[PDB]
Each structure stands twice: as C-alpha cells, then as structure tokens.
Amino acid sequence: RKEKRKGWNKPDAFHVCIVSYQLVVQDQHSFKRKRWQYMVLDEAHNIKN
Amino acid sequence: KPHRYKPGTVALREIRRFQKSTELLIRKLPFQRLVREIAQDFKTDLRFQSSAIGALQESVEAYLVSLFEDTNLAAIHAKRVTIQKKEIKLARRLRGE
Amino acid sequence: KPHRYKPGTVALREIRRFQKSTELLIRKLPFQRLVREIAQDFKTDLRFQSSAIGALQESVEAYLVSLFEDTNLAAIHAKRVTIQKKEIKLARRLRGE
DNA sequence: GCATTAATGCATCCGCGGCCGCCCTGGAGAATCCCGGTGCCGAGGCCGCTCAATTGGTCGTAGACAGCTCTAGCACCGCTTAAACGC
DNA sequence: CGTTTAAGCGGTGCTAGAGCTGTCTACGACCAATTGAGCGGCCTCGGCACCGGGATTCTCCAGGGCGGCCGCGGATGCATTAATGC
Incomplete structure (x- = not known):
C-alpha cells in the first residue's frame, strides 16, 4: 500500500480508486488528506449502525 | 541478484531505531494476564485500575534496559559481542542482588 | 641445596594467615597524617579525637576487603588469577558508583 | 598327437591435456533528512466558587548567653623491636 | 636474602575545648475574622501527528586476470591359443 501511495498525491495517476471497507478504519488518517468527488458504498447494510 | 545485508548491519539500525523511541515494547494483554497471574x-x-500497570511495565522496561546495559558492559569486559547467562548472573550479583 | 617455594604457595598460607586475623593492616600514623591532610x-x-579514626580505618579496610572480593570475582570471570585495572573499574562501576 | 609359433586379445604404464579458483575493479540500491500539507485535540484562558492563609492578640517556654569545671587531646622524649625496601 | 626508618609503647606537662547548669526574652504555639488567590468546569484553536516530494548519502553488489593439476587413452608387453608343420 506504500507502493500504491508513492505515486498518489501530486499527479493524477488514477481516475477512480478501489479501497475495501475495513482498510479505511486503519488508513483513515491517510485517505482524509486527499479531496474526492464521489464516494460510493456497496451493500450499505453494513454501515446501517 | 538478491540484496541481503551482512550480519551485523540491521542490529545497528535497530539500535538507532529503538533508541529514538520512548514507546513500550511489551503488549498490554500478556502483561495484564501475567500481573493477574502473579496476583x-x-x-x-x-x-x-486502568493506571498502575504501565508503571510496573515502565519500571520493568527501564530496569531491564539498565540491566541489559550493565550486562552488555559485562559482555564487553569478556572481549566479545555476545551476551551469556554468566554475564546476567555476574551483572545481577555485582549490583547487590 | 637451597629450599625455595614454587610460585603460588606462600599466597595460600598468607590467605590462611591473614583471614584468621581481625587486626588492622594499616598503621595509625600515615592514616593520621592522611586524615589530617584531607582535613x-x-x-x-x-x-x-582518639576515637573516630579506627572507625574510618575500619570501614575503609572492610569496604576495601569487600571491593577486593568483588574485584576478585570479576577477575575470576575473566578466567585468570590476576587482578587488573579494568576489573576495578568493572566491579566499581557495577556496584552503582 | 605334440611342440612351436605367429597371431592376437587384452596389459598396466606412461605421457599428454584439461580443470578452474581468489584479488581488483565494474557501480547498484535503497535508507535518511528535511521541507511542506492538512486534519486533530488537549493547554490554557475564563468563570464560579470557596476555604485555609493572613493579621492581630495572648501566653508560656525552650535557646543563646555566660559560668564554671574538668578531663582527655596535644606535643614530646626515648627504648625496642619490626615491617618496608632494594635487589 | 640483608639492611633501615619509623611505629608501639612507657611515661610527662599542659590546656583549651567539651560539658552540665541559672535568666529572660525574643518568639513561636493556639485561637477569632476576612478574603483572594487557587481550585473544579469549560471550550476553544494553533501547535502537534503522520506522511508525500525530493535531494542526499547509505551500504552493498558481480565480474576479471594470476597460479598448478588430475582424466584418460594410446600403447604395445605379455600370454594365450589354434594353426600348423613335424
């Protein structure tokens, strides 16, 4: 993931990122830095609490 | 062509890495069940309490660090780089224990 | 035919001789002029006073005896019978000084 | 039929040829330092409150000031060996 | 091993500092009244936490030219054996 995040900040190396559900709990300090346009939630009965 | 370090390099950067860190090296749950086991x-x-466990772990960690420094100097007196059991008995007995 | 002892015999009977004696091994006048010199x-x-000089000489003698025993065990750890300066620095530093 | 004798099927002996490994120099690779970049959270400021410090009075009480005494430390002189020292 | 300098010890004349005892007098223990500085509560925002970008220094990487071998086969000595002449 550090190798994925070494071409991440300054240029636009991707138009859409695929991040799992449980990885944002650990990497929430890192994914909050970059601004996003769309964030979608698949099968949203997990975040219902 | 694999890239491997010679024996004796990673220990030095582990000394440089951990000697700059003030964190605890022992987990809270085995020390918790150990303290409850002796208790x-x-x-x-x-x-x-939620307190008074990192105090025992802190004095155990720092006292064991000073014991590893005195035992390390005892192994230095033996003109080698390896720590032995008689170095722990020597540096343990010579401190008044 | 001269009669001479091998090296290592007279030290043992000196240990047997002085270890049975409770007398002071330092004279009163150089310790007197030494105590007055530091004073x-x-x-x-x-x-x-006429007292309080054999107390300093007694604690100096017994403390130096225990230091020679700990330094002697430090020289025993070095797998030799000779005492060295690094043994005195080792046994002096490892006692908390 | 038997000796012998040349042919010949192997004989060990000799001679020629192949086997590379260790110092010196070709740089390769990633760990660290430092400077931004933005989200996070507890240090301290502000307020409400509130209680032992402060001030003064009372009262009695041990500590410094002599006072006097007394007694072992100080400085010393001279036999008498005895550890310290040089080698 | 032999040779010396100096403590141990017996005895001496002192004194100056150690040691037990009255006086009173500063001077601290014990007690009311005020309050103001310090302590519980709070809620913010600028320094702190973590990591990218990039330069820098860290720390290891694999090929290149100098020696003395053993592996093996040709040989052609030896011994045999059937041809063959007696």
Whole structure:
C-alpha cells in the first residue's frame, strides 16, 4: 500500500480508486488528506449502525 | 541478484531505531494476564485500575534496559559481542542482588 | 641445596594467615597524617579525637576487603588469577558508583 | 598327437591435456533528512466558587548567653623491636 | 636474602575545648475574622501527528586476470591359443 501511495498525491495517476471497507478504519488518517468527488458504498447494510 | 545485508548491519539500525523511541515494547494483554497471574495466588478476587500497570511495565522496561546495559558492559569486559547467562548472573550479583 | 617455594604457595598460607586475623593492616600514623591532610583544605585548624579514626580505618579496610572480593570475582570471570585495572573499574562501576 | 609359433586379445604404464579458483575493479540500491500539507485535540484562558492563609492578640517556654569545671587531646622524649625496601 | 626508618609503647606537662547548669526574652504555639488567590468546569484553536516530494548519502553488489593439476587413452608387453608343420 506504500507502493500504491508513492505515486498518489501530486499527479493524477488514477481516475477512480478501489479501497475495501475495513482498510479505511486503519488508513483513515491517510485517505482524509486527499479531496474526492464521489464516494460510493456497496451493500450499505453494513454501515446501517 | 538478491540484496541481503551482512550480519551485523540491521542490529545497528535497530539500535538507532529503538533508541529514538520512548514507546513500550511489551503488549498490554500478556502483561495484564501475567500481573493477574502473579496476583492470583496472593489474594483471590482482586481488582486492578486502568493506571498502575504501565508503571510496573515502565519500571520493568527501564530496569531491564539498565540491566541489559550493565550486562552488555559485562559482555564487553569478556572481549566479545555476545551476551551469556554468566554475564546476567555476574551483572545481577555485582549490583547487590 | 637451597629450599625455595614454587610460585603460588606462600599466597595460600598468607590467605590462611591473614583471614584468621581481625587486626588492622594499616598503621595509625600515615592514616593520621592522611586524615589530617584531607582535613587541611576543608577547614583549617581542626582537632580529632582518639576515637573516630579506627572507625574510618575500619570501614575503609572492610569496604576495601569487600571491593577486593568483588574485584576478585570479576577477575575470576575473566578466567585468570590476576587482578587488573579494568576489573576495578568493572566491579566499581557495577556496584552503582 | 605334440611342440612351436605367429597371431592376437587384452596389459598396466606412461605421457599428454584439461580443470578452474581468489584479488581488483565494474557501480547498484535503497535508507535518511528535511521541507511542506492538512486534519486533530488537549493547554490554557475564563468563570464560579470557596476555604485555609493572613493579621492581630495572648501566653508560656525552650535557646543563646555566660559560668564554671574538668578531663582527655596535644606535643614530646626515648627504648625496642619490626615491617618496608632494594635487589 | 640483608639492611633501615619509623611505629608501639612507657611515661610527662599542659590546656583549651567539651560539658552540665541559672535568666529572660525574643518568639513561636493556639485561637477569632476576612478574603483572594487557587481550585473544579469549560471550550476553544494553533501547535502537534503522520506522511508525500525530493535531494542526499547509505551500504552493498558481480565480474576479471594470476597460479598448478588430475582424466584418460594410446600403447604395445605379455600370454594365450589354434594353426600348423613335424
């Protein structure tokens, strides 16, 4: 993931990122830095609490 | 062509890495069950606060660090880089224990 | 035919001789002028009783005996019978000094 | 039929040829330092409150000031060996 | 091993500092009244936490020219054996 995040900040190396559900709990300090346009939630009965 | 370090390099950067860190190297749950394990046969059905566990772990960690430094100097006196059991008995006995 | 002992015999009977004796091994007059010499530059024109000199000589003698025993065990750890300066620095530093 | 004798099927002996490994120099690779970049959270400021410090009075009480005494430390002189020292 | 300098010890004349005892007098223990500085509560925002970008220095990487071998086969000595002449 550090190798994925070494071409991440300054240029636009991707138009859409695929991040799992449980990885944002650990990497929430890192994914909050970059601004996003769309964030979608698949099968949203997990975040219902 | 694999890239491997010679024996003796990673220990130095581990000294540089951990000697700059003030964090605790022992986890809270095995020290918790260990403290409760020693506290089992002394007095049954005791309670421990959220504090006073990192104090025992802190004095155990720093006292064991100073014991590893005195034992390390004892192994230095033996003109070698390896720590032995007689170095721990020597540096343990010569401190008044 | 001269009669001479091998090296290592007279030290053992000196251990047997002096270890059975409780007398002081330091004379009273060089310890007197030494105590007055250290007492010269602290406070001028002092007086010393007839007591309190064999107490300093007694604690100096017994403390130096225990230091020679710990330093002797330190030289034993080096797998030799000779005492060295690094043994005195080792056994002196490892006692908390 | 038997000796012998040349042919010949192997004989060990000799001679020629192949086997590379260790110092010196070709740089390769990633760990660290430092400077931004933005989200996070507890240090301290502000307020409400509130209680032992402060001030003064009372009262009695041990500590410094002599006072006097007394007694072992100080400085010393001279036999008498005895550890310290040089080698 | 032999040779010396100096403590141990017996005895001496002192004194100056150690040591037990009255006086009173500063001077601290014990007690009311005020309050103001310090302590519980709070809620913010600028320094702190973590990591990218990039330069820098860290720390290891694999090929290149100098020696003395053993592996093996040709040989052609030896011994045999059937041809063959007696």
